[PDB]
Curated annotation (Swiss-Prot), chain A:
It is an enzyme of class 3 (hydrolase). Cleavage by different proteases, such as granzyme B (GZMB), caspase-1 (CASP1), caspase-8 (CASP8), caspase-9 (CASP9) or caspase-10 (CASP10) generate the two active subunits. Its involvement in different programmed cell death processes is probably specified by the protease that activates CASP7. Cleaved and activated by initiator caspases (CASP8, CASP9 and/or CASP10), leading to execution phase of apoptosis. Cleavage and maturation by GZMB regulates granzyme-mediated programmed cell death. Cleaved and activated by CASP1 in response to bacterial infection. (Microbial infection) ADP-riboxanation by C.violaceum CopC blocks CASP7 processing, preventing CASP7 activation and ability to recognize and cleave substrates. Changing R132K: Does not significantly affect thiol protease catalytic efficiency. GO terms for biological process: apoptotic process; cellular response to lipopolysaccharide; cellular response to staurosporine; defense response to bacterium; execution phase of apoptosis; fibroblast apoptotic process; heart development; lymphocyte apoptotic process. This is Caspase-7. The gene is CASP7.
């Protein structure tokens, strides 16, 4: 209890959702079908958790940057924590805007104590569902502001198939939401996210020798600098 | 239940401890005093958790590579998990051998799912303590890294005692090691070294060095060293 973040605040905090579905053809990236379904789930889910959710769509690089900076400049004094979720295309250390590419570390750095005193000693959660596109990544969180109270959940797992409407949705993202609804108010985040890792990991039906399940195995990556346990409830 | 790793085996598992204190001149690196304090602290600690701890000192890059290559090649059918602890100098995805540098991905390379079936589905723990300052260190299921600083940072202590990180880990483990889940333990460590920080020096035109341990997790279940 002196081992978990103080959640006795006016409000839980803000939850920013960047939903990037469409991209300029100059980037070579295609439509991210299924992203809308993830967005829909996430916002409903975090809303339920008690977050004040904002959803942005098809943002430019400048758009994402000004977006987060401004947020890192608001007064988070009456908030317990802060959450940001990025849904787009990604390449080692980068995420796509519709017009180009920006480094994730710049997107998150805005919230480092130095430049956001109002969220000091407060958990800052980043859930990224990027994925190379149209054998995993690295760990040295250098493409992340290594500072206390920061937590990243990077996917990279692709939303592989999809006919359409409402689309199936990304695995990682749907797992997250599913668990976060059923247990959002009982489990600690690392519990939530560990259950998530497992769930997407199982989607690759173990190590099947069947020429139908043989593929690029992937799993989310959880990076924690949290200094206390995180519960969203009472 | 199906939410925690199955610890029902004869042994907890192997725990290799690489303790590189002295380095050849050709690397331009200096003695890591206090790492012997760390190494021992870590030994009695992990040994007490239940690991079969073996410590190796001032290893060469070749030595560390082979050391871990052989470990992966052993039979872990009666093991619940595996754990490697590295104490040394580091810069990024690479740690220091006593005769040069070797990257991290290589140490964990031969443990990936396919390459070590016996340890498959079971947790491979890596506790790293690098300092000072190849590439990409993969992301496989059931691996967990606990970096002392973060690829290319600092870690300090008190002339006579080991790193704050190590000391924190041993103290917490040597107290809740058997009742708290791995992530809890590590979080408290994160908090412990935090409190120790944002120091006093007096060359305000030199004192930068900070520190926040960090935990990369690909675990698929909760981890307890008990039951």
């Amino acid at each position: 209890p002196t081992y978990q973040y103080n959640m006795n605040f006016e409000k839980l905090g803000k939850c920013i959702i960047i939903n990037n579905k469409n991209f300029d053809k100059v980037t070579g990236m295609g439509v991210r079908n299924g992203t809308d379904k993830d967005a829909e789930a996430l916002f409903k889910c975090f809303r339920s958790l008690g977050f004040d959710v904002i959803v942005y769509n098809d943002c430019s690089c400048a758009k994402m940057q000004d977006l987060l900076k401004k947020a890192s400049e608001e007064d988070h004094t009456n908030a317990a924590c802060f959450a940001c979720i990025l849904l787009s295309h990604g390449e080692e250390n980068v995420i796509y805007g519709k017009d180009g590419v920006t480094p994730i570390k710049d997107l998150t750095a805005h919230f480092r104590g130095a430049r956001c005193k109002t969220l000091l000693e407060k958990p800052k959660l980043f859930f990224i569902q990027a994925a190379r596109g149209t054998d995993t990544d690295a760990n040295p969180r250098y493409k992340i502001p290594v500072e206390a109270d920061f937590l990243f959940a990077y996917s990279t797992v692709p939303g592989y198939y999809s006919w359409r409407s409402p689309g199936r949705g990304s695995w990682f993202v749907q797992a997250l939401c599913s668990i976060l609804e059923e247990h959002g108010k009982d489990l600690e985040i690392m519990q939530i996210l560990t259950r998530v890792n497992d769930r997407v990991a199982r989607h690759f039906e173990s190590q099947s020798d069947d020429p139908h399940f043989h593929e690029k195995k992937q799993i989310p990556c959880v990076v924690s600098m949290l200094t206390k346990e995180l519960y969203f409830s009472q």
